[PDB]
Ligand binder design. Structure first.
Ligand SMILES: Cc1ccc(N2C(=O)CCC2=O)cc1
Ligand SMILES: [Cl-]
Ligand SMILES: [Cl-]
Ligand SMILES: [Cl-]
Ligand SMILES: [Cl-]
Ligand SMILES: [Cl-]
Ligand SMILES: [Mg+2]
Length: 342
């Protein structure tokens, strides 16, 4: 066990191992400080979780986040550098701290002057990370430019996995502009195909400099979507589980899919083709991440011997019914068993 030291930073007590120095608040589910890690030489973000075990729902969320971060080991996905608690036993266990690489710019802070070569490299990396994530049957659910970190060499990492309230999704808000229509309107049980819709929205915005579907509310956004991709046919309508939602869709006048070369004027014809394969209303028919990596748009970067998949991931806890102290004890076991990366 390392030696810990205590300090108050912005009305919060932080108790951390001596290796972490020069803590500086940078953000406020928890508070975040930047620090220098003297063991690795990296600048890091240290997150102190807020009330991690306040309810069954909160305690399960804490366990879910730690399990996910401990599993992710890929160049294009955020990984866990350290996790610690100052408690010396389960009996006194109350606080959880998570340590990651400190990220600078996100994709918004780049969306600069982008060549087609830049768009190829950025979207390639998102898809490489998503192939890995999806191979473990994980769905990110919240892909958008602010959840993508990018450095000076155009290297990218996915962060902030979906672990959002009704209020946060209301109105003219970027928190909804990248969501697939079937999850935005609760059409049906969703799966990993929702993330590919989000990639299509991000790629379009890199090519044009503008948000693809900046709706002022849920219904305005649906109308923007259906104008581009067309109204649904009977085949997709049968897959929408709510009679009310089916009824609403049928109230709209029918529209054909638009010509994407006349929307994305001047774009690489291979980029236009890939967008048509991502932005498909019926999620059963969207291209997958593994299939998209082999698309000719990425010919300069695709290497099928360097696009790895994940170790198997056990999510059986998600259907388990436990008490607060049982989720807390499971979380404690995961804290003390952590083994740092090389
Ligand atoms: C409204 C709008 C704005 C930009 C673009 N565009 C592309 O899609 C590739 C290069 C370019 O300028 C197309 C439409
Ligand atoms: Cl230490
Ligand atoms: Cl990382
Ligand atoms: Cl504690
Ligand atoms: Cl964003
Ligand atoms: Cl596992
Ligand atoms: Mg975020």
């Amino acid at each position: 066990r390392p030696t810990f030291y205590r300090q108050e930073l912005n009305k919060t007590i932080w108790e951390v191992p001596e290796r972490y120095q020069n803590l500086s608040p940078v953000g406020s589910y928890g508070s975040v400080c930047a620090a220098f890690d003297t063991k690795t030489g990296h600048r890091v973000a240290v997150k102190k979780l807020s009330r991690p075990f306040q309810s069954i729902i909160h305690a399960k969320r804490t366990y879910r986040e730690l399990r996910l971060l401990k599993h992710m080991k890929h160049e294009n996905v955020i990984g866990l550098l350290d996790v610690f608690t100052p408690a010396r036993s389960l009996e006194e266990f109350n606080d959880v701290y998570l340590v990651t690489h400190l990220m600078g710019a996100d994709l918004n802070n780049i969306v600069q002057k982008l060549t087609d070569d830049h768009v190829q490299f950025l979207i390639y990396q998102i898809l490489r990370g998503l192939k890995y994530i999806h191979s473990a049957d994980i769905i990110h659910r919240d892909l958008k430019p602010s959840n993508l970190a990018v450095n000076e060499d155009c290297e990218l990492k996915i962060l902030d996995f979906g672990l959002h309230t009704d209020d946060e999704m209301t109105g003219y808000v970027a928190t909804r502009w990248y969501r697939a229509p079937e999850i935005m309107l609760n059409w049906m049980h969703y799966n990993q195909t929702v993330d590919i819709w989000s990639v299509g929205c991000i790629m379009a915005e890199l090519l044009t400099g503008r948000t693809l579907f900046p709706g002022t509310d849920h219904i305005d956004q649906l109308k923007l979507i259906l104008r581009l991709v067309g109204t649904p046919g009977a085949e997709l309508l049968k897959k929408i589980s709510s009679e009310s939602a089916r009824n609403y869709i049928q109230s709209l006048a029918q529209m054909p899919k638009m010509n994407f070369a006349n929307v994305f004027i001047g774009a690489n014809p291979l980029a236009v083709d890939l967008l048509e394969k991502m932005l498909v209303l019926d999620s059963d028919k969207r291209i997958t991440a593994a299939q998209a990596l082999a698309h000719a748009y990425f010919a300069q970067y695709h290497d099928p011997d360097d696009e790895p998949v994940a170790d198997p991931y056990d999510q059986s806890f998600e259907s388990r019914d436990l008490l607060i102290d049982e989720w807390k004890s499971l979380t404690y076991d995961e804290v003390i068993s952590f083994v740092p990366p090389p």
